[PDB]
Ligand binder design. Structure first.
Ligand SMILES: CCO[C@H](COc1ccc(C(F)(F)F)cc1)CSc1ccc(OCC(=O)O)c(C)c1
Length: 260
């Protein structure tokens, strides 16, 4: 359908406009310049070059965690502007918009994070760094436990070989969940959701004719992400309570407040 075909395009264009990183841009960088962070020496070098103000000191693990949070805060802003392209989102009650973004952002973050991840590491700092998976595993607990579950999800997610046209709709569908707690107008949100999911189903059928189960596979990935986010918040809570030097950005505190 032209109406749905153009809706898919609208979403895709809002995704390209509002997110600094996309899969094509990430694969260009990852093909072959990003500074490689593989040990403590290269981490400290990268900090002096890419986040100089940060180290003009606390444990490396705490500094890394603060850099992680800065990326989240930035992606929240990107996701908030992206949400406007979703038919009906800007028409929802202002409180429902906040609730949908509150519960959706981290699911969206980890879904999109897969695009800059491969089995050896991930792009960081607006594509200018590459931190290795093994270095992250080498951090002292509990900080070494943060990223490995995200790599596990990303390797299987990337095996699906989605492109940005698919991912834009997937992220839209994540935001349009009518079963988020505290929604005022569930019925309108469900209809909004049904509309995005309908476009996603048709788009996957056209864009991925070789994989007839791709749509149900992504439905399951949405459930997987919800559990990934729940477990992530639990680890974040442990760090907040037991790491006196690891403070949470207030915007991210509110997102976690009364989540899981
Ligand atoms: C390490 C994984 O983090 C990536 C960026 O981390 C950086 C590490 C080092 C540097 C620097 F280049 F400055 F050294 C930059 C980013 C961003 S992805 C991310 C996003 C959110 C995360 O959880 C924090 C949160 O709940 O908001 C975590 C643990 C990771």
């Amino acid at each position: 359908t032209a109406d749905l075909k153009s809706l898919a395009k609208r979403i895709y264009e809002a995704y390209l406009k509002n997110f600094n990183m996309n899969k094509v841009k990430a694969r260009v960088i990852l093909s072959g310049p990003p500074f490689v962070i593989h040990d403590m020496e290269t981490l400290c070098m990268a900090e002096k070059t890419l986040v100089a103000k940060l180290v003009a000191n606390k444990e490396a693990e705490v500094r890394i965690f603060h850099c992680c949070q800065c990326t989240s805060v930035e992606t929240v802003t990107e996701l908030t502007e992206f949400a406007k392209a979703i038919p009906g989102f800007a028409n929802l009650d202002l409180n429902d918009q906040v609730t949908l973004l509150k519960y959706g952002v981290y699911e969206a973050i980890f879904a999109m994070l897969s695009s800059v991840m491969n089995k050896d590491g991930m792009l960081v700092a607006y594509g200018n760094g590459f931190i290795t998976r093994e270095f992250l595993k080498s951090l002292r607990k509990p900080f070494c436990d943060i990223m490995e579950p995200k790599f596990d999800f990303a390797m299987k997610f990337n095996a699906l070989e989605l492109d940005d046209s698919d991912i834009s709709l997937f992220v839209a569908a994540i935001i349009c969940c009518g079963d988020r707690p505290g929604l005022l107008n569930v019925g309108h949100i469900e209809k909004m959701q049904e509309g995005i999911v309908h476009v996603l189903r048709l788009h996957l059928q056209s864009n991925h004719p070789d994989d007839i189960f791709l749509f149900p596979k992504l439905l399951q990935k949405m459930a997987d992400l919800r559990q990934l986010v729940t477990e992530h918040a639990q680890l974040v809570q442990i760090i907040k309570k037991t790491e006196s030097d690891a403070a949470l950005h207030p915007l991210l505190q509110e997102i976690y407040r009364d989540m899981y």
